[PDB]
Design a protein around this ligand. Structure first.
Ligand SMILES: [Mg+2]
Ligand SMILES: [Mg+2]
Ligand SMILES: [Mg+2]
Ligand SMILES: [Mg+2]
Ligand SMILES: [Mg+2]
Ligand SMILES: [Mg+2]
Ligand SMILES: [Mg+2]
Ligand SMILES: [Mg+2]
Ligand SMILES: [Mg+2]
Ligand SMILES: [Mg+2]
Ligand SMILES: [Mg+2]
Ligand SMILES: [Mg+2]
Ligand SMILES: [Mg+2]
Ligand SMILES: [Mg+2]
Ligand SMILES: [Mg+2]
Ligand SMILES: [Mg+2]
Ligand SMILES: [Mg+2]
Ligand SMILES: [Mg+2]
Ligand SMILES: [Mg+2]
Lengths: 117, 48, 103, 142, 109
RNA sequence: CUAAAACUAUGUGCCGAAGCUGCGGAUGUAUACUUUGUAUACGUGGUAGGGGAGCGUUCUGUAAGCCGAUGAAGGUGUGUU
RNA sequence: GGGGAGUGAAAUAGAUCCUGAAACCGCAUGCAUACAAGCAGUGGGAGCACCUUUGUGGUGUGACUGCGUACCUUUUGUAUA
């Protein structure tokens, strides 16, 4: 039962090289280099699934800060005031309202201010 | 139910042989259960 | 008409006719669900903010179906330690369409 | 729904003039850099230049506290075997006030193509007069 | 419609012939013939042979007019090498590859 | 950076991890009743190493069967599980 | 050496002649690229081009941006120069 390694080996190399399209030089042509390139890409993607949620929350907090400082507060005091008024809108929606609807955001800032005083 | 097509052995009577040196996912890959760098890691390694 | 609703542990800002994906639901494809824990309603210089809920506000939606997102590949590796591991993932979702917002 | 980025084609930069007579240098530089980057706008996007233009006038009337007018050193290297060059704050302010704001503000910005493109919107003049009267700047009381 | 001519097995390397092929790509047939006529390069002779053959094929088998023709396509490919041995100093031996090319011309209006 | 953007003392907020909570999914062990089906609970970072379960490859029987010139194996793309 | 003609079911079956992979080397089209510093990806993300529908679609490219020093072996310990 002599077994030849021609078809399965060729298909494995082919599948690894099909996942390396767009890479530069030997990284999309040479199996040894493309294999390390695909593994490192998977590692990077695993770590950036975690980092994406931090980056987006930082962006929401910055936009809410910009919106609150036009209404007379800092981010800290608006978030504290909204928590003291039992408003539970999260930051993803607050940043949306800051970026698209200035009147409703002024209403929210007034509610927070009233809660603080 | 009686054909050369339809005869199976009892459950738990056959096992696959253990195969060393066939990749990472097997658990018996690189060194094949022998450790690192001793007399017992050599070929014909046991002492009398 | 811009209401704010809760679903699947997250919050959404919806209008009428909008189609959106949320986490998997137990409801049946073709049924009708109703969100009656509404957080804010804006109808144009008329703004109802819930503390934490707007009292008599309703949002109705229809279940179009259930599906899976595209495949994600998880790869764990430890360099110089003889350790590699791989996995696949597809996440489930329910597709809703917004029918009415009461206010 | 999702978080949208600002489109560069929809961005609108505005023009402001700020007077520097009798002002601490770094406490002005932080405000200038914050306006140059666009952090005061609710459409702020870290990969988009949504900032504003700033004009500084009377750049030779800016101040430092303590003993820094005589003791703060500015350095340069020409990349020749002994080409380190040294100057003062007070020698450099009566002779090149544009470079003091250049350094103070550029140190407070990102370091890459978008940071190079933001510093272009700062215009520093030693005297009371600027040439950009056609752009209609506003008086920003920083 | 393009009319083809092939010159397979030219005894020159493709890198040397590509320089002359870059000079006449996309030009009128008479201008390219002039360029090839007044060249001091060795690849110019082979490229002129292939171009003359393509013009003759276009006018004989396809019956086209010549003042309207153009060098629409031209490219050079590699052929098979000849392996030889060169004795070096102190008993060492080097391998010499003698290279070949294929010229392809396509003439069209 | 100088009545600080330093130091000491006090207070009120906020930011901040793959920690914890929320929502969806998989899996190990043990238990409870059907009597094999789900709940409940605790767990699920890993080198050397031990245990368990699988995919694919060539060949023999099943096979004088089944598919194939209305196009097999092989090669090259696309879609999907 | 080729282009017609002709044979043949087939001539990128034409004698280096079944099938004809990869490394390597050209020609053509689309997009990007000559003020910007590093394992070349990854998470975002504008614009353009081509398909298509009256799209919160598909395909190619990727300005700008956060993070980020290959693999194996041997070691107390390696981006390791
Ligand atoms: Mg192990
Ligand atoms: Mg060893
Ligand atoms: Mg040892
Ligand atoms: Mg040992
Ligand atoms: Mg000799
Ligand atoms: Mg907090
Ligand atoms: Mg977190
Ligand atoms: Mg956890
Ligand atoms: Mg859970
Ligand atoms: Mg484990
Ligand atoms: Mg754990
Ligand atoms: Mg063929
Ligand atoms: Mg052949
Ligand atoms: Mg440029
Ligand atoms: Mg460089
Ligand atoms: Mg050593
Ligand atoms: Mg040592
Ligand atoms: Mg290290
Ligand atoms: Mg080196």
């Amino acid at each position: 039962a002599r077994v030849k390694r021609g078809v399965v080996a060729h298909r494995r190399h082919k599948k690894i090289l099909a996942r390396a399209k767009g890479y530069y030089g030997a990284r999309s042509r040479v199996y040894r280099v493309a294999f390390q390139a695909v593994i490192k890409a998977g590692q990077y993607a695993y770590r950036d699934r975690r980092q994406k949620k931090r980056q987006f929350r930082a962006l929401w907090i910055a936009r809410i800060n910009a919106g609150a400082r036009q209404n007379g507060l800092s981010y800290s005091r608006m978030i504290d005031g909204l928590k003291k008024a039992q408003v539970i809108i999260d930051r993803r929606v607050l940043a949306d309202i800051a970026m698209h609807d200035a009147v409703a955001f002024a209403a929210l800032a007034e509610k927070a201010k009233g809660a603080l005083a | 139910t009686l054909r050369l097509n339809e005869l199976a052995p009892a459950e738990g009577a056959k096992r696959e042989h253990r195969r060393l040196g066939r990749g990472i996912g097997s658990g018996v890959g690189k060194t094949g259960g022998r450790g690192i760098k001793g007399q017992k890691s050599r070929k014909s390694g046991g002492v009398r | 008409m811009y209401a704010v609703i809760q679903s699947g542990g997250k919050q959404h800002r919806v209008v009428e006719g909008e189609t959106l994906k949320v986490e998997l639901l137990k409801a049946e494809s073709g049924a009708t669900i109703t969100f009656d824990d509404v957080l804010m309603v804006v109808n144009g210089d008329n703004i109802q903010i819930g503390a934490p809920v707007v009292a008599g506000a309703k949002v109705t939606a229809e279940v179009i179906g259930h599906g899976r997102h595209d495949k994600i590949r998880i790869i764990k590796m430890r360099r110089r330690k003889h350790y590699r591991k791989q996995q696949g993932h597809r996440q489930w979702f329910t597709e809703l369409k917004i029918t009415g917002i009461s206010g | 729904m999702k978080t949208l980025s600002a489109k560069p084609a929809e961005v609108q930069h505005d023009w402001f003039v700020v007077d520097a007579t009798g002002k601490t240098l770094g406490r002005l530089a932080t405000e200038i850099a914050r306006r140059l980057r666009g952090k005061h706008k609710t459409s702020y996007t870290p990969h988009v230049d949504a900032g504003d233009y700033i004009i500084v006038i009377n750049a030779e009337q800016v101040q430092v506290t303590g003993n820094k007018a005589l003791d703060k050193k500015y350095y340069r290297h020409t990349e020749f075997p002994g080409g380190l060059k040294e100057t003062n704050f007070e020698k450099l302010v009566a002779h090149k006030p544009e470079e003091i704001f250049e350094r103070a503000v550029k140190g407070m910005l990102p370091k890459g193509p978008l940071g190079y493109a933001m510093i272009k919107k700062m215009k520093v003049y030693a005297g009371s007069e600027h040439p950009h009267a056609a752009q209609q700047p506003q008086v920003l009381d920083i | 419609m393009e009319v083809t001519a092939k010159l397979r097995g030219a005894a020159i390397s493709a890198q040397k012939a590509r320089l002359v092929a870059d000079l006449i790509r996309g030009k009128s047939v008479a201008h390219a013939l002039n360029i090839l006529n007044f060249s001091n390069k060795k690849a110019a002779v082979l490229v002129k042979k292939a171009l003359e053959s393509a013009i003759a094929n276009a006018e004989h088998n396809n019956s086209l007019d010549v003042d309207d023709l153009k060098v629409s396509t031209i490219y050079v490919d590699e052929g098979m090498s000849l392996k030889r041995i060169m004795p070096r100093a102190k008993g060492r031996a080097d391998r010499i590859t003698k290279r070949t090319c294929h010229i392809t011309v396509k003439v069209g209006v």
